[PDB]
C-alpha cells in the first residue's frame, strides 16, 4: 500500500492514543485485570517504524511518535481529555502531557519519600496504639498524602490565599497531621470518634518556595458526598469576602476547593452531579474544584461492577467537560506531577479537574472483617503487595537516584517519624440588644430606589406599576408582604450587611411578587433596585451588597451551598428560597445532617434562612406544605428558629432581628403564596418604624380598636393565613364571644408572651388549636403534646380543629380542599 | 555577647523563637532531646549540628532525609556568616554574630 | 504544500465533524444565538474541493466528503457519539448517520402530519375549553407526539411487548390521547388536576406494520425526575415476569422504558445521574432507556446559563457513554428518524440513548405570566414563529411532496380532529386468612440448604461455621435474627413467591450476619443457599426465586427502584435494606412522594419492605436512628405498617404475613445491629411452627414460666433491644413489682391487644414509655399524644423515660451514650 | 343475505364489530354521523365510502389524509372481492360477500 495510506493510519493511530490510550495505561497497582493489556498493526508494520511522518510542523519516525504516545498515555497516567469541547483546553493538556518530562530532582524525590514516611508512620501508630481504627485506614492509599501536598504547594506557588478541603473519614487524622498540620496533642486529646467529623484550620509552608497558604478542612456527616455543595458555598463566601472571583475585583479565585472522594460514593451519589452542575454558574462558581478520588477499587464489600455502569468511577465529571487523570497509586512522582498539572489547568481555565488515584484497601472495611470472604482474589493479590513507601525507596535505589547511605537516612527518618508520634501521645497522659425598626426616610429611600432607574432603561409595561406601587407604599402605607421583605433586606444593605438571596426563579419570584432584578424590555439588561442602598447619599459605600440569583433546578446542592455560604461568612444574611416548600424534602440530608444539627455535633454555626412557600389553596399535595411538623420534630432548645408570620411588618422585624441579633442560628420561615396579594394582609408605616418582632399576636380590635376581651369565651389559637378567614367570618357573623390569637414564632415556643396574652381573656371556657394541615401534620403533633406540659394552667383541655389525618400533605382535588376549609371555619364557629 | 552566635526562626511554626549558640556542638532536629527542637515531619530525628571550633561557626548535616541548606544552597558542611539563612526541613533560621 | 499535508488535514477535518459538528448544527428552531454559525480553511482551499482523498476503501473528492459530513452532522441533527468507549457502537452510529438517507414516503409524511394535526388540535381544545391549562401546554413542542409515536412504532417493529412511559406534566393529557390512546370521555370525566399524575395503560397499533404493543404510563409526583428510578424498577419487575432480559431466558428486554424530561430538571436533579448509574448493573439494568428531553430552552423564568454548567442539558448522559442526538423540533421527519435510530441502538447494544428535542414554550409558564418580563428577546422571537403543523404543511407543498388538494385534505383532517375532541367532551355533560407458621421439615430444609453446597465448592474458613450453625439452629433451636429472616424468605420461595432483596452490601450483610450469597475461596464463584428452595424434592419448580443483589452507593435511586419493582409485580416480596437507617433520608423524596402517599393520591399500591438498621450503641448520630418519629408522622390509617420486632421469630411471622396477607401495603422495619448477636434475642423451633405475629408482647415468665402479674405495680412499655437490658436488670435486682410490655407493631397501633394485655395487671399504679431515642424522637412524640386519646382508661397519666430532646439522633461520644443508657435503666427502676 | 355484503373489524379498538353493506353508499369516517363510525385520530372526519352500483361493491377514498388501502395497496377507488382487507386509518376491516 501507498505512503498516503500509511500516513492516514498514523494520523488515526495518533488520535487512537489521545482518545483511548487511557484504557491500556498501567494505572492499577494490583494488576487485577489479566486481560487489560496490538493497536499498532492496522496497515502499519515493523517496516514502517523508521519511516518518517509529518507532525505539528516537523517530520518524525513512527517509533519516535509511538514512544511519545506510549510515555504520555500508556504508562502510569491515564489521560482523558478529548471529550472537552473547548479546543484551547485540549491543546493545553496535549502540550503538557506529550512533552519530554524532566525527572524530579533528588531533593523533590527525597521530599516525596519524607511525606510517605510521615503517612505510613501515622497509619502504623493508629493501628498499633488504638483498637477499632481499621475503618479509617489509609493503608494502601498513603500516596494521597504527597499528592495532596503537591496540590497545596502548587496553589501556594500561584500565590493563592487558601485551600479548603472536604473529605470522607478514610485517612482524615493523617490529613490533619501531615497536610493541615494539626499537632498530635490536639488530634489525640481524648480518644474514645467526633474527631473524624470536626473542621480544622492550619498554615501550609512551601518546602522549596517562598510562600505560605492557609489550609482548612470543613466539618461533615457520615453521609458520603453530602458535604460536596457545602464546601462549594463555603469557598464562594470566602472568595466574595476576599474580593476574588465572580463577585470580586480579580479573576484569581484565590480560595481553592480540594474535594476528596471514595470510588463507590463518587459514582452512586446524585449530589456529585448536582455540585458539578454548579461549577460554572454565576451564582455558584468557585473557579474550579480539584477533585481526588481515592480509588481503592472496592466499596465496603461491593465490587466496582455492582457500583457503577461506566468504565471509571469519575465518568460523571464528563458532564461538565472536566479533564480526568487516572493515576497509579504506586507511582508517587506521577501522583504529585498530575496534582500540579491539575492546579495549573484550574488556574488557566477556572474549571474542575478530576484525579482518579488508583490504589487498594490493605485491611477489611472495619475491625472484624475478613475481606477475602467477599473478595478472595483481590485480597490474595493485596496480601503479597509491598507498601508504597518501601516500594518507592526500592525504586530510587534501583534507578540509582539515591545512594545506600541515603536509603538508610530515609529509613532512619521513618523510625524517627514513628518515634515522634508514639512519644508526643505518650507525654499526653449572646443576643445583641438592637432595634429592628427603621425611620420613615429608610422606607422612602427603598421605595424611591425602585423608580431610580438607569439612564435609557426600558421597563416592561407590567413591571412599571410594581415599581410605582412600591414608591406609593413607602410614602402612604398599605405595605404588602413582597415589599416588606425588600424593606428588610434593603435596610440591612444600607447598614453595611452582605445579603445573598437565591432559589428557583427567586429574582422575579415564583408568584411574580419579588422583582428584585428587572429586565430591560429592548436590550435584556438587568437592574437591581436594592443595589442602590449599597451606596450612601454622599456616594461612599456602606459595605453592603445585594447578591440575588436564580438557582439551578436543584434542592440538595442549592440548600447545601447556601448552608456552606453562611458558614463561610457568619456576617452575611443568607436566604435560600424553595419554589414551594413541598420540594425542600429533596434537600433532607442537608436539613438533617447540617442545618438542624451541625452546632450540637461539631460546634459549627450557621445563620442560613430557608423560605418555604406554604399554605392550603387546592393546588395539590406537592404545592401545599413545607412540612411544618418535620422541622418542629427536628427542633431542640437553641437548634433553629421556626416561624410562620401572618403580617408583612412582623416578617420584616423577623428578618431584621435574624440579621442583627449577633447569634448564628438557622431560620425556617413558612412563607405565603395567595396571602401575598391578600388586601387585608397589609401593614402600616408605623408597624415598621415604631414596633419590633411579635412572637404572639392579638386582633387589632383588642390592641388599637374598641374590642372588649371580657366578652370572649372561646379562644382560637392559630398561625398563618387562616387567621384572615377566621377574622372575616367573625366580622360577617358579628361574634364578640370569639377571639383569634396568632403564634408567629413556632419555635422556640414563646411561653411567657403566650401566658401574658391568654391572661387578658379571663372568661375563656374553651381553647382550640386551629390549622389547615391534617391532624398528623402542621403544628398540632408537637403543640398538642408540649402546650399542656409547658403551660398547664393555660392549655390543659386544648382541643384540635383541623383537616383529618392524611398520608399526603393534602387532597388532590381543589373542590375537596374548598369543602374541607369551610368545615374548619364552620367548626371553629360551631 | 561576643564570640556567641544567635539563631532566629523566621519561617516555621515557631517563628520568632531564638536559640543561643554558646557550645562546641549544638544539635538541631526532631528528637525532643535536641538543643534546637524543630517539630515537623520535614525535619529528621537527627538532622543538623551547629559546631563551634576556633572562631568560626559551622552547620553540618548529620544524615537527614531533606538535607540542610545555607542561603538556598544544599550543603554537607558550611562555615556561617552574620545574616546567613539555614533551612532545616520547612524551618528557615537566621544566623546572627 | 504537499498532497501528504493536504491528506492529513482532510483526515483531521473528518474527525472535527464527527467530534464537533453538533456545535454547528441547525438544532435551534428559534435561532436565538446569532454567533452559532470556516472550519474547512485549515491548509485546505477552494482549489482542493475537486482533489480526491482516500476514505474507508474508496477515493472521494473533498466536496463529496464535505456534503456527506454536513448532511450527517450539521443539518437539523446534532450527533454526539465519539465519547463512547466501545468502538463497535461508534462504527454502528457512524454507518447509519453518514449513509445517504432515502426520504420518507408520502404515506409516512402524511402520517407524521396526521399526528401533528392531532397534537395541535388537542392543545387548541385544552387552552380554549378550560382555564388554567397554560402550565401544561405542549405548544411549541407538539413534534414530541410524532417522535414518541416513532419510538413506540419502532419497538412494535422489533416485536417487543410493552413501552412504559415516565414523564412530567407538560403535554401529559396530549400523550394520553394521542400516544397511550385513552378516550376523551375518560381523560375529561370530571375536570377541575389529579389527571396530571395518574397511571394509564393502552394498546398501540402500528399504521404500516402487523404488530401491536402495550403502552403504559406510570404515576408520578410534581417532583421533577423523582419517578426516573421508579420507572426503571417497574420495567425490570415486568421484564422478570416476562422471562426477558438479565433474569430471563432471552436477551430481548422486551419491556422498554421511555423516559421524558424537562431541560432544567434533567441537568439539576441528582436522581438523573443516580438512575443512569443503574443502566448496566446486573440487579437494575432494563436493557437501556430511551430518553426524551423536551428542550424548550427555559425553566419557568430561568435561562439555560443559570441552570447548567455544560453546553447541553443532556451532558450527564456522557457519564455512562450514551449516544446523544440533538434534534430540531421544527423538523418532525428528523425527529421521527432519530427516534427510530435510538430504538435500534438500544436493541443492538442494550444501553440508553438520549434524544434532545430542541423546541420552545409558546406561552408563559402559567396563566397570568407575561414571559417577556424575564425573557423579552426569546418571546419577541417566539411571537413571530409559525406553528410546527402549518410549517410542516408549508414544507411538504414547497418540496412538492404533497399536492394542494392533499394540503386541503390535511387542513380538513385538522378541523375534523378539533371537532372530534370538542364534540365528544360536549356529549359528556381485604386480608387473606393464611397461617404464617411452617412445619419443622421446612425449617430443617432451609438449614440443610446452607450445607447442600455445589460439587467442588470451597467455602471461606470463616463462612463454614455460619453454614453449620444454621443447620444446628434448624434442628435444635436457639435461632438468631439473621437465620429467622432467611427462614421467612426461603419458606416463601418454597411456596412459589418471587423474593427480591437488595441494598448496600446486602448479600453478606453490613454486620457479616446474612451470607445470602457465599464466595468460592479459590474461584470467586457465587452460591445462593435459598435458591435451592425454588425446586421441590421431586425436582419440579415451585415458581419461587431468590433475587439478591448488592446495590450501588445510592439511596434515592435504590429505594425508588425497589418501590417501582413492587408496583411492577404486586406478587413479589420486595425488600430494600439501608446500610444504617440513618442514610434513608437521602431517599426522602421517594418515602414522601411515593411509598407513604401513592395509594391515597393515585390509587397506586406498593408492598415494598424497607429494612432500617436502628439502635443506640454509641456509634454516632449517623449510625443510630432510622428516624422512627418521621415514619410515624407520615402514617395515616392504612398508609403503611411500621414495626420494630425484638424477637427473631416475631420478625419471621411479620415478613411471612407481609408476603401472604393479599394486601399491598408498604412495610417499614427498624432492624437490629448488635441485637443480631445478643444470646438472649434468640427463638425456639415452636415459635416458628406453633405461633403467629404478635403486635404486643409480654415477658415469657408471665406466659410460659411462673410469673405473678398481680405483684406488678409499675409497667414499662417499650420497643426494640432496650427490653433485654431492662429484663437483665429485673433478673439481677430480682424485681417482681415491675413488668415489661413490648409494642412490636408501632403502626397501626394495636389498640385491642394493648388493652387486653394491660388488663392482666390489675395492681398497676404508674405506666411509663421507655425508649433509647431523645424525647423529640422515637415513638414518644406520637404515642405520648395518641395512647391517652385512643385508650383513656389505660394511658392517662403515661409518663416518659428516655434520652433528653436533641437536635441530632444521638450524642457523638460513645462514653456519653453509655452514661445516658444506664440513666434510663436507673430511672425505669428508680 | 344474498346481494348484501359484510365488514368485520379485525384490527382496531373495536375489533369484532360488524357493519352490514345494504345501501347504495355507506360512509366510513370519524364524523359521529358516519354509517361506519371508526373512532381514531388516524381516521379523517370524512374518510371513505363503500358504494354499491349494479352487483359490485366498491371502496372509494373521499379526501382522507391517511388514505384507503385494499390488501396493503393504496387506492383512490377499488372493486372489492370476498376476503379483501380494507385499511381506514389504523383499522383493518375484512370484506365478506
Ligand atoms: C450517603 C451514605 N450512604 C451510605 C453510607 C454507608 N457506608 C459507609 C459507612 O457509613 C458504614 C460502614 C462502616 O461501618 O464503615 S462506608 C460505605 C462504603 C464507601 O465506599 P467508597 O465510597 O468506595 O469508600 P471507601 O470506604 O474509602 O472505599 C458505605 C456504603 C454512607 N456513609 N453514606
Ligand atoms: C424537584 C422539583 N423541584 C422544583 C419544582 C418546581 N418547578 C415546577 C412546578 O412544580 C412549579 C411551578 C408551577 O406552578 O408550574 S416547574 C419548574 C421548572 C421546570 O423546568 P423544566 O425542567 O425545563 O421543564 P418545563 O417546565 O417543561 O420547561 C420547577 C422548578 C418541581 N416541580 N420539582
Ligand atoms: Ca443571626
Ligand atoms: Ca402484602
Ligand atoms: Mg472505595
Ligand atoms: Mg424547560
> How many angstroms separate the Cα of C597 from the Cα of each of A815, A829, C166?
20, 32, 18
Adjacent-strand bridge partners of A59: A54
Which residues in C lie closer than 8 A to residue D74 (C-beta atoms)?
107
Q: For chain D, how big is the Rg over CA atoms in Å? A: 12
Which residues in A lie closer than 8 A to residue B28 (C-beta atoms)?
none
Nearest CA to ligand 1 atom 20: A299
Centroid of ligand 1 to alpha carbon of A223 (angstroms): 8
Asked whether the bond before C748 is cis by omega within 30 degrees of 0, the reply is yes
Adjacent-strand bridge partners of B53: B56
Place of cell 411567657: A752
Cβ count within 10 A of residue A813: 16
DSSP readout, C483-503?
HHHHHHHHHHHHTT-EEEEEE
> Running DSSP on this structure, what letter comes out for residue A535?
B
Measure in Å the smallest separation between the Cα of A180 and chain B Cα atoms.
12
Contact between A797 and C591 (Cβ < 8 Å): no
Alpha carbons A261 and A265: distance in angstroms, whole number: 7
Alpha carbons B29 and B46: distance in angstroms, whole number: 5
Contact between D35 and D26 (Cβ < 8 Å): yes
Alpha-helix residue ranges (DSSP H) falling in A21-78:
62-73
Measure in Å the smallest separation between the Cα of D28 and chain C Cα atoms.
14
Is the four-CA dihedral D66, D71, D74, D79 of positive or negative sign?
Answer: negative
- A478 Rama class: left (phi>0) / alpha (psi -120 to 50) / beta: left
Contact between A248 and A240 (Cβ < 8 Å): yes
The residues near C571 (Cβ < 8 Å, ≥ 6 apart) are C497, C498
Place of cell 518556595: A209
Each residue of C325-334: b (16+ CB within 10 Å) or e? bbbbbbbbbb
Contact between A101 and A337 (Cβ < 8 Å): yes
Site to probe by mutation for ligand 1, drawn from C274, C550, C553, C618 as the one with most ligand atoms within 8 Å of Cβ, is C553
DSSP readout, B50-70?
EEEETTEEEEEE-S-SS-EEE
Residue of A nearest to C367 (CA): A511
Is the four-CA dihedral C131, C134, C136, C142 of positive or negative sign?
Answer: positive
Contact between C721 and C613 (Cβ < 8 Å): no
Alpha carbons A606 and A566: distance in angstroms, whole number: 5
> How many angstroms separate the Cα of C542 from the Cα of each of A317, A337, C398?
47, 60, 65
Q: Where are the beta strands (DSSP E) in A250-352?
A: 255-262, 290-295, 324-328
Contact between C327 and C355 (Cβ < 8 Å): yes
The residues near A162 (Cβ < 8 Å, ≥ 6 apart) are A213, A214, A215, A216, A238, A254, A255, A256
Asked whether the beta carbons of residue C118 and residue D41 sit closer than 8 angstroms, the reply is: yes
Look up residue C285 and give its three cell numbers.
439494568
The residues near C184 (Cβ < 8 Å, ≥ 6 apart) are C177, C421, C424, C425, C428
The residues near A432 (Cβ < 8 Å, ≥ 6 apart) are A660, A661, A662, A663
The beta-carbon neighbor of D45 closest among C111, C405, C419 is C419
- Expressed in percent and rounded to 5, the helix, strand and coil fractions of chain C are 45, 15, 40
Each residue of C94-111: b (16+ CB within 10 Å) or e? bebbbeeeeebeeeebbb
What atom of ligand 1 comes closest to residue A141's alpha carbon? 27
Measure in Å the smallest separation between the Cα of A256 and chain B Cα atoms.
22
Alpha carbons C166 and A493: distance in angstroms, whole number: 46
Q: Is A59 exposed, middle or buried (0-12, 13-18, 19+ CB in 10 A)?
A: exposed
* Mutate: best of A122, A186, A409, A421, partner B, most B CBs <10 A: A409
Residue C331 CB less than 6 A away from ligand 2 = no
Site to probe by mutation for ligand 1, drawn from A170, A222, A229, A360 as the one with most ligand atoms within 8 Å of Cβ, is A222
Query: Measured between CB atoms, does C114 come within 8 Å of chain D?
Result: yes
Is the four-CA dihedral C480, C481, C487, C488 of positive or negative sign?
Answer: positive
Contact between A666 and A595 (Cβ < 8 Å): yes
Place of cell 408496583: C567
Asked whether the beta carbons of residue A416 and residue B30 sit closer than 8 angstroms, the reply is: yes
Measure in Å the smallest separation between the Cα of B94 and chain A Cα atoms.
15
Is the four-CA dihedral B36, B37, B39, B45 of positive or negative sign?
Answer: positive
Alpha carbons D7 and A575: distance in angstroms, whole number: 70
* Surface of A (431-460) touching C: CB under 8 A: 460
Query: Measured between CB atoms, does D11 come within 8 Å of chain C?
Result: yes
Ligand nearest to the CA of C553: 1
The beta-carbon neighbor of C416 closest among D11, D13, D30 is D30
Alpha carbons A84 and D17: distance in angstroms, whole number: 60
Site to probe by mutation for ligand 2, drawn from C170, C300, C357, C361 as the one with most ligand atoms within 8 Å of Cβ, is C300
Walk across the sheet containing D77-79 and list its strands: D36-37, D25-29, D48-53, D56-61, D77-79
Q: For chain A, how big is the Rg over CA atoms in Å? A: 32
Give the CA count within 13 Å in the CB-facing half-sphere of C441: 4
Cβ count within 10 A of residue A150: 26
Q: For chain B, how big is the Rg over CA atoms in Å? A: 12
**Total number of residues shown for chain D:** 97
> Running DSSP on this structure, what letter comes out for residue A426?
H
Adjacent-strand bridge partners of A293: A261, A356
Look up residue A686 and give its three cell numbers.
408605623
Adjacent-strand bridge partners of C479: C683
Alpha carbons C691 and C696: distance in angstroms, whole number: 14
Adjacent-strand bridge partners of D51: D25, D58
Which residues in D lie closer than 8 A to residue C206 (C-beta atoms)?
90
Centroid of ligand 1 to alpha carbon of C681 (angstroms): 28
Closest CA to C814 of C552, C616, C583: C616
Which residues in D lie closer than 8 A to residue C409 (C-beta atoms)?
44, 63-65
> Running DSSP on this structure, what letter comes out for residue A179?
I
Give the CA count within 13 Å in the CB-facing half-sphere of C357: 33
Alpha carbons A828 and A712: distance in angstroms, whole number: 14
Q: Where are the beta strands (DSSP E) in C135-268?
A: 162-166, 200-205, 212-217, 255-262
The residues near C171 (Cβ < 8 Å, ≥ 6 apart) are C136, C137, C138, C141, C142, C144, C145, C294
Residue A135 CB less than 6 A away from ligand 1 = yes
Walk across the sheet containing C766-774 and list its strands: C696-697, C738-743, C714-718, C766-774, C799-803
Pairing of strands B36-37, A745-747: unpaired
Which chains form contacts with chain C, at 3 or more CB pairs under 8 Å?
A, D
Closest CA to A813 of A621, A614, A566, A573: A621
Q: Where are the beta strands (DSSP E) in C506-645?
A: 518-519, 526-527, 545-550, 573-577, 609-613, 641-643
* Mutate: best of D41, D43, D67, D69, partner C, most C CBs <10 A: D41
φ/ψ of A353, rounded to 5, equals -135, 135
Q: Where are the beta strands (DSSP E) in A638-785?
A: 641-643, 667-671, 696-697, 714-718, 738-743, 745-747, 766-774
**Total number of residues shown for chain A:** 830
Place of cell 378539533: C418
Centroid of ligand 1 to alpha carbon of A365 (angstroms): 9
- C264 Rama class: left (phi>0) / alpha (psi -120 to 50) / beta: alpha
Alpha carbons A807 and A774: distance in angstroms, whole number: 9
Q: In which element (H, E) is residue D94 found?
A: strand D91-96
Structural domains of chain C sorted by starting position, each given as residue range(s) with its CATH number in brackets: 1-75 (1.10.287.1150), 76-428 (3.40.50.970), 429-614+641-694 (3.40.50.12470), 615-640+695-830 (3.40.50.11610)
DSSP readout, C84-123?
-S-HHHHHHHHHHHSSPPPPPPHHHHHHHHHHHHHHHHHH
Resolution (A): 2.4
Cβ count within 10 A of residue C323: 27
Structural domains of chain B sorted by starting position, each given as residue range(s) with its CATH number in brackets: 5-97 (2.60.200.20)
Walk across the sheet containing C353-358 and list its strands: C77-80, C324-328, C353-358, C290-295, C255-262, C162-166, C212-217, C200-205
Residue of C nearest to A6 (CA): C4
Asked whether the beta carbons of residue B90 and residue A417 sit closer than 8 angstroms, the reply is: no
Alpha carbons B77 and B59: distance in angstroms, whole number: 6
What atom of ligand 1 comes closest to residue C622's alpha carbon? 10
Q: Where are the beta strands (DSSP E) in A197-315?
A: 200-205, 212-217, 255-262, 290-295
Q: Which contacts qualify for A535-543: CB closer than 8 Å, 24 or more apart?
A: A536/A494, A542/A493, A542/A494, A542/A495, A542/A496, A543/A496, A543/A497
DSSP readout, A73-104?
HSSSEEEE-TT-S-HHHHHHHHHHHSSPPPPP
Alpha carbons C468 and C451: distance in angstroms, whole number: 7
Residue C805 CB less than 6 A away from ligand 1 = no
Closest CA to C180 of C209, C156, C214, C206: C214
Amino acid at each position: 500500500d501507498s505512503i498516503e495510506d500509511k500516513n492516514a493510519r498514523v494520523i488515526e493511530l495518533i488520535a487512537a492514543y489521545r482518545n483511548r490510550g487511557h484504557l491500556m495505561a498501567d494505572i492499577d497497582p494490583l494488576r487485577l485485570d489479566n486481560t487489560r493489556f496490538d493497536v499498532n498493526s492496522h496497515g502499519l508494520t515493523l517496516w514502517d517504524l523508521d519511516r518518517e511522518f509529518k507532525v505539528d510542523v516537523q517530520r518524525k519516525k513512527l517509533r519516535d511518535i509511538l514512544s511519545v504516545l506510549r510515555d504520555a498515555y500508556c504508562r502510569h497516567v491515564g489521560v482523558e481529555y478529548t471529550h472537552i469541547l473547548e479546543p484551547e483546553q485540549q491543546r493545553w493538556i496535549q502540550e503538557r502531557v506529550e512533552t519530554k518530562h524532566d525527572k524530579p530532582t533528588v531533593a523533590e524525590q527525597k521530599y516525596i519519600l519524607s511525606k510517605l514516611n510521615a503517612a505510613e508512620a501515622f497509619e502504623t501508630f493508629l493501628q498499633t496504639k488504638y483498637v477499632g481504627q481499621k475503618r479509617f485506614s489509609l493503608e494502601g492509599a498513603e500516596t494521597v498524602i504527597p499528592m495532596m501536598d503537591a496540590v497545596i504547594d502548587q496553589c501556594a506557588e500561584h500565590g493563592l490565599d487558601e485551600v479548603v478541603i472536604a473529605m470522607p473519614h478514610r485517612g482524615r487524622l493523617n490529613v490533619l497531621a501531615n497536610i493541615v498540620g494539626k499537632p498530635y496533642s490536639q488530634i489525640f486529646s481524648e480518644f474514645e470518634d467526633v474527631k473524624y467529623h470536626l473542621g480544622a484550620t492550619g498554615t501550609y509552608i512551601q518546602m522549596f518556595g517562598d510562600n505560605d497558604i492557609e489550609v482548612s478542612l470543613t466539618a461533615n456527616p457520615s453521609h458520603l458526598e453530602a458535604v460536596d455543595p457545602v464546601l462549594e458555598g463555603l469557598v464562594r463566601a470566602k472568595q466574595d469576602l476576599l474580593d476574588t472571583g465572580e463577585e470580586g475585583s480579580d479573576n484569581r479565585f484565590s480560595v481553592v476547593p480540594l474535594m476528596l472522594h471514595g470510588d463507590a460514593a463518587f459514582a452512586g451519589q446524585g449530589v456529585v452531579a448536582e455540585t458539578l452542575n454548579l461549577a460554572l454558574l454565576r451564582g455558584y462558581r468557585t473557579g474550579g474544584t480539584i477533585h481526588i478520588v481515592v480509588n481503592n477499587q472496592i466499596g465496603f464489600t461491593t465490587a466496582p461492577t455492582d457500583s457503577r455502569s461506566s468504565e471509571y468511577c469519575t465518568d460523571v465529571a464528563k458532564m461538565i467537560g472536566a479533564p480526568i487523570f487516572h493515576v497509579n497509586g504506586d507511582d508517587p512522582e506521577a501522583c504529585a506531577w498530575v496534582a500540579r498539572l491539575a492546579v495549573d489547568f484550574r488556574q488557566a481555565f477556572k474549571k474542575d479537574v478530576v484525579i482518579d488515584m488508583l490504589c487498594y484497601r490493605r485491611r477489611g472495611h472495619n475491625e472484624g472483617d475478613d475481606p477475602s470472604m467477599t473478595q478472595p482474589y483481590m485480597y490474595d493479590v493485596i496480601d503479597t503487595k509491598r507498601g508504597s513507601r518501601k516500594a518507592y525507596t526500592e525504586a530510587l535505589i534501583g534507578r540509582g537516584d539515591i545512594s545506600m547511605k541515603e536509603a538508610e537516612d530515609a529509613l532512619r527518618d521513618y523510625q524517627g517519624q514513628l518515634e515522634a508520634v508514639f512519644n508526643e501521645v505518650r507525654e499526653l497522659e449572646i443576643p445583641s440588644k438592637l432595634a429592628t425598626a427603621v425611620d420613615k426616610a429608610m422606607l422612602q429611600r427603598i421605595g424611591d430606589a425602585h423608580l431610580a432607574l438607569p439612564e435609557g432603561f426600558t421597563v416592561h409595561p407590567r413591571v412599571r406599576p410594581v415599581l410605582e406601587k412600591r414608591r406609593e407604599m413607602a410614602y402612604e402605607g398599605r405595605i404588602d408582604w413582597a415589599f416588606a421583605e425588600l424593606l428588610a433586606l434593603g435596610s440591612l444593605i444600607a447598614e453595611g450587611k452582605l445579603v445573598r438571596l437565591s432559589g428557583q426563579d427567586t429574582q422575579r419570584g415564583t408568584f411574580t411578587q419579588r422583582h428584585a432584578v428587572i429586565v430591560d424590555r429592548k436590550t435584556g439588561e438587568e437592574f437591581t433596585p436594592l443595589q442602590l442602598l449599597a451606596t450612601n447619599p454622599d456616594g461612599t459605600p456602606t459595605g453592603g451588597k445585594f447578591l440575588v440569583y436564580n438557582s439551578a433546578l436543584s434542592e440538595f446542592a442549592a440548600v447545601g451551598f447556601e448552608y456552606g455560604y453562611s458558614v463561610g461568612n457568619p456576617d452575611a444574611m443568607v436566604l435560600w428560597e424553595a419554589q414551594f416548600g413541598d420540594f425542600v424534602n429533596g434537600a433532607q440530608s442537608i436539613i438533617d445532617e447540617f442545618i438542624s444539627s451541625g452546632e450540637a455535633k461539631w460546634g459549627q454555626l450557621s445563620d442560613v434562612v430557608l423560605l418555604l412557600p406554604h399554605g392550603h389553596e387546592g393546588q395539590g399535595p406537592d404545592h401545599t406544605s413545607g412540612r411544618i411538623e418535620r422541622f418542629l420534630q427536628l427542633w431542640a432548645e437553641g437548634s433553629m428558629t421556626i416561624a410562620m408570620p401572618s403580617t408583612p411588618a412582623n416578617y420584616f422585624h423577623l428578618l431584621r432581628r435574624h440579621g442583627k441579633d449577633g447569634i448564628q442560628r438557622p431560620l425556617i420561615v413558612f412563607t405565603p403564596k395567595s396571602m401575598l396579594r391578600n388586601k387585608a394582609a397589609v401593614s402600616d408605616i408605623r408597624d415598621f418604624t415604631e414596633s419590633k418582632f411579635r412572637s404572639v399576636l392579638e386582633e387589632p380590635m383588642y390592641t388599637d380598636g374598641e374590642g372588649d376581651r371580657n366578652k370572649v369565651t372561646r379562644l382560637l389559637l392559630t398561625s398563618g393565613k387562616i387567621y384572615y378567614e377566621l377574622a372575616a367570618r367573625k366580622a360577617k357573623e358579628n361574634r364578640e364571644d370569639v377571639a383569634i390569637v396568632r403564634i408567629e414564632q413556632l419555635a422556640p415556643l414563646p411561653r411567657r408572651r403566650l401566658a401574658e396574652t391568654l391572661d387578658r381573656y379571663p372568661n375563656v371556657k374553651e381553647k382550640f388549636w386551629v390549622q389547615e394541615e391534617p391532624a398528623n401534620q402542621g403544628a398540632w403533633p408537637s403543640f398538642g403534646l408540649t402546650l399542656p406540659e409547658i403551660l398547664p394552667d393555660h392549655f390543659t383541655g386544648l382541643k384540635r380543629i383541623s383537616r383529618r389525618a392524611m398520608s399526603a400533605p393534602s387532597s388532590g382535588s381543589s373542590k375537596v380542599h374548598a369543602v374541607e376549609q369551610q368545615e374548619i371555619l364552620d367548626t371553629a364557629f360551631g | 555577647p561576643s564570640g556567641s552566635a544567635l539563631l532566629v526562626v523566621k519561617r516555621g511554626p515557631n517563628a520568632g523563637s531564638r536559640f543561643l549558640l554558646d557550645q562546641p556542638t549544638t544539635s538541631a532536629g526532631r528528637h525532643p532531646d535536641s538543643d534546637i527542637f524543630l517539630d515537623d515531619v520535614t525535619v529528621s530525628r537527627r538532622h543538623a549540628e551547629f559546631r563551634l571550633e576556633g572562631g568560626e561557626f559551622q552547620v553540618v548535616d548529620v544524615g537527614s532525609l531533606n538535607g540542610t541548606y545555607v542561603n538556598r544552597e544544599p550543603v554537607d558542611s558550611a562555615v556561617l556568616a552574620n545574616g546567613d539563612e539555614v533551612q532545616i526541613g520547612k524551618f528557615r533560621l537566621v544566623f546572627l554574630t
